[PDB]
Amino acid sequence: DDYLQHSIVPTMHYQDSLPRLPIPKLEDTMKRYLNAQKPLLDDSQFRRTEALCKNFETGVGKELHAHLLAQDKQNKHTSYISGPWFDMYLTARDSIVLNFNPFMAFNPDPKSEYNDQLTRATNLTVSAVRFLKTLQAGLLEPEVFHLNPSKSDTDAFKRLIRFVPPSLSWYGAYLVNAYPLDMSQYFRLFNSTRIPRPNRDELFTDTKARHLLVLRKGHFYVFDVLDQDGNIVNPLEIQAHLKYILSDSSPVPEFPVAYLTSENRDVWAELRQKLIFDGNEETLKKVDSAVFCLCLDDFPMKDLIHLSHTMLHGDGTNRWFDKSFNLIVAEDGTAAVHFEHSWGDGVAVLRFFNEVFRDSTQTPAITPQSQPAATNSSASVETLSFNLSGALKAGITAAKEKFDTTVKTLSIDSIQFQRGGKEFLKKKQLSPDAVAQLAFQMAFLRQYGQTVATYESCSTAAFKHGRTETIRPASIFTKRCSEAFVRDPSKHSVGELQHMMAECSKYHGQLTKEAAMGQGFDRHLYALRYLATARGLNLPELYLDPAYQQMNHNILSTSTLNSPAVSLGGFAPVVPDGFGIAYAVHDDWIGCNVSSYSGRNAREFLHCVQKCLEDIFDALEGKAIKT
Numbered sequence: 001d002d003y004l005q006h007s008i009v010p011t012m013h014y015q016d017s018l019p020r021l022p023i024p025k026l027e028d029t030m031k032r033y034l035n036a037q038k039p040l041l042d043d044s045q046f047r048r049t050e051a052l053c054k055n056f057e058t059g060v061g062k063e064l065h066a067h068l069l070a071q072d073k074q075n076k077h078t079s080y081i082s083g084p085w086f087d088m089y090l091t092a093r094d095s096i097v098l099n100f101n102p103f104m105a106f107n108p109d110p111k112s113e114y115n116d117q118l119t120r121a122t123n124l125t126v127s128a129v130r131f132l133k134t135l136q137a138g139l140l141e142p143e144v145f146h147l148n149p150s151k152s153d154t155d156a157f158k159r160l161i162r163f164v165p166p167s168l169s170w171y172g173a174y175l176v177n178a179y180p181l182d183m184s185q186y187f188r189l190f191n192s193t194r195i196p197r198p199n200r201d202e203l204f205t206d207t208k209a210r211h212l213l214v215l216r217k218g219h220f221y222v223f224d225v226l227d228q229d230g231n232i233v234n235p236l237e238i239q240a241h242l243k244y245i246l247s248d249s250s251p252v253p254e255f256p257v258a259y260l261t262s263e264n265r266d267v268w269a270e271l272r273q274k275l276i277f278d279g280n281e282e283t284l285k286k287v288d289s290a291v292f293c294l295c296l297d298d299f300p301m302k303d304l305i306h307l308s309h310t311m312l313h314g315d316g317t318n319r320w321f322d323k324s325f326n327l328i329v330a331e332d333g334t335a336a337v338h339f340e341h342s343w344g345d346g347v348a349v350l351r352f353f354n355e356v357f358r359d360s361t362q363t364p365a366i367t368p369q370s371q372p373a374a375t376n377s378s379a380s381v382e383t384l385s386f387n388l389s390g391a392l393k394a395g396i397t398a399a400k401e402k403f404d405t406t407v408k409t410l411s412i413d414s415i416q417f418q419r420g421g422k423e424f425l426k427k428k429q430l431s432p433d434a435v436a437q438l439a440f441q442m443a444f445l446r447q448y449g450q451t452v453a454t455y456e457s458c459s460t461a462a463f464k465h466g467r468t469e470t471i472r473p474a475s476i477f478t479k480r481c482s483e484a485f486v487r488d489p490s491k492h493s494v495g496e497l498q499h500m501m502a503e504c505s506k507y508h509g510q511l512t513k514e515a516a517m518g519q520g521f522d523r524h525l526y527a528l529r530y531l532a533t534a535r536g537l538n539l540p541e542l543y544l545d546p547a548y549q550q551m552n553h554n555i556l557s558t559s560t561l562n563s564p565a566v567s568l569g570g571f572a573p574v575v576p577d578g579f580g581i582a583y584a585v586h587d588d589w590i591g592c593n594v595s596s597y598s599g600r601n602a603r604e605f606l607h608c609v610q611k612c613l614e615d616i617f618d619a620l621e622g623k624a625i626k627t
């Protein structure tokens with residue numbers, strides 16, 4: 001059948017009974033805030049910030065917190081941060097490219113010849129559409145974190161839990177140490193896009209649409225991938241339609257319309273209204289409503305740097321950046337998912353990504369020797385046509401100029417530390433994640449001699465409408481340990497360094513456990529500020545503190561995903577003088593793919609990361625450190 005899974009537990013079985021996102025006690029939030037400021041602030045700065053926190057906790061902060069709690073109890077169907085967080089993305093006026101949109105790239109199909117572009121584009125497309133059908137049938141297994149898959153991720157448990165009503169289901173899982181996650185975002189995976197508007201962009205879905213959108217050389221093509229009965233279109237016909245697009249001989253358009261999706265959101269909002277004025281709404285709706293956007297690039301990947309640039313931004317002509325996601329397939333079959341961030345999070349995109357990798361590699365729809373159907377693709381595939389005014393053409397030229405200028409400022413590079421990973425570190429009773437994070441702290445100290453604002457994403461999807469909380473890796477412990485290794489390594493014994501690392505790891509583990517339970521401080525302080533602003537009040541003095549601004553200017557922005565389907569991933573820095581650090585700790589090795597703008601140096605940072613990882617592993621093996 002057209003399904004990639006056959007869950008007996010309905011996909012959405014736990015949704016109704018998910019726990020609500022906790023609101024921390026304000027006293028906890030202020031303590032945690034200060035704990036994270038301790039490594040960043042001089043004594044005088046910290047004392048000023050400390051006084052502000054005291055007045056906030058007993059003053060206007062107490063009052064905003066009471067209101068936040070009252071509001072949350074009138075809105076038990078959601079989380080206190082969901083509205084504010086959708087706003088953070090959707091009110092943002094800057095380009096979604098680089099600032100927000102990440103990518104994850106697939107490993108190759110293990111079978112060499114299945115990496116043919118036509119073959120793999122067909123197979124990946126069909127798997128993605130199989131995913132859509134599986135979700136819609138309620139046949140996709142619910143997303144569940146298991147503390148022990150051996151006990152709870154079993155047919156025995158599945159057999160019973162399917163009889164527990166959704167009002168009670170979450171508790172059945174909880175009782176077996178299993179934690180169903182929110183899946184509300186899955187409704188925006190397909191047939192969905194972000195529409196530029198004044199003030200705040202709009203999330204559009206049209207679940208009735210049956211067509212795929214394909215970009216090749218900046219030309220837009222659409223064809224049905226679901227028939228009138230809801231069945232997947234013959235994969236041989238899909239293959240034929242993709243071959244038809246690959247065969248087209250038209251050069252890149254004079255004014256590639258896709259550039260517009262990389263613009264400032266007010267500029268793009270105006271230009272889209274003008275497209276509508278000029279009679280393009282029907283065409284735009286075909287773009288907006290397609291199941292997803294498939295992008296066919298006509299060049300192979302030169303190396304991982306080329307891959308990163310290609311999947312993170314491309315050349316401006318061949319990505320519809322607004323779409324829920326773009327599935328990119330290069331000439332050498334290298335594929336990736338590039339996604340718009342407002343609707344979704346790593347956890348949900350990864351589930352899709354993982355199921356599509358599994359299905360396209362283990363049960364490919366077509367082979368490299370399949371013969372395309374003899375189908376009238378000239379009729380079945382529509383090449384979209386936009387009516388562009390003089391203003392639209394000027395807009396596209398200005399969109400390209402801005403795009404090209406920004407991309408020029410961006411560098412990306414990677415390391416693959418081969419000496420060890422999870423296996424070695426777990427044997428040393430350390431958190432692998434903490435160790436990578438320590439390395440980044442230590443590397444930044446070695447390169448720049450500073451301790452800076454650092455962000456690590458953590459999923460709160462265990463809660464209703466949960467997205468993320470911020471882990472703050474830059475701690476008193478990491479600062480102390482980085483100082484020891486970098487500035488006075490002769491001053492500490494190998495045992496003392498090991499203790500310093502144990503402490504780092506413990507504290508990181510504590511921060512991680514807390515953030516996952518909604519017990520970070522960032523989202524809570526964020527919501528309180530949002531609430532003051534929404535109620536028409538002046539910004540509280542806590543938020544005018546330069547220390548608050550500095551804490552939220554994340555020079556080191558980090559995120560990790562763990563998957564055998566992932567070759568690499570990436571995102572640009574979140575501030576001009578930042579690094580965007582995508583990393584993974586594997587059993588045997590640690591990879592980082594780091595982005596930077598002109599004001600930082602990613603190549604030097606990565607050389608520093610490598611050295612720090614060498615020092616860390618040396619000390620853990622009891623070897624005196626190489627200086």
Ligand SMILES: CCCCCCCCCCCCCCCC(=O)N[C@H](CC(=O)[O-])C[N+](C)(C)C
Nearest residue numbers: 102346457468559561568569582583591592593
């Ligand atoms: C050569 C080895 C390289 C391996 C890289 C591992 C892949 C990691 C890819 C992560 C890309 C981002 C995926 C999820 C998006 C995400 O984490 N968004 C974060 C969302 C949030 O709310 O924190 C934002 N930010 C990236 C800026 C921290």
Ligand SMILES: CCCCCCCCO[C@@H]1O[C@H](CO)[C@@H](O)[C@H](O)[C@H]1O
Nearest residue numbers: 161164167168169170171172173175
């Ligand atoms: C077979 C699966 C076992 C289901 C056990 C149901 C337990 C749900 O009981 C729950 O207890 C909570 C604390 O008192 C309350 O917040 C909820 O209102 C209540 O429904």
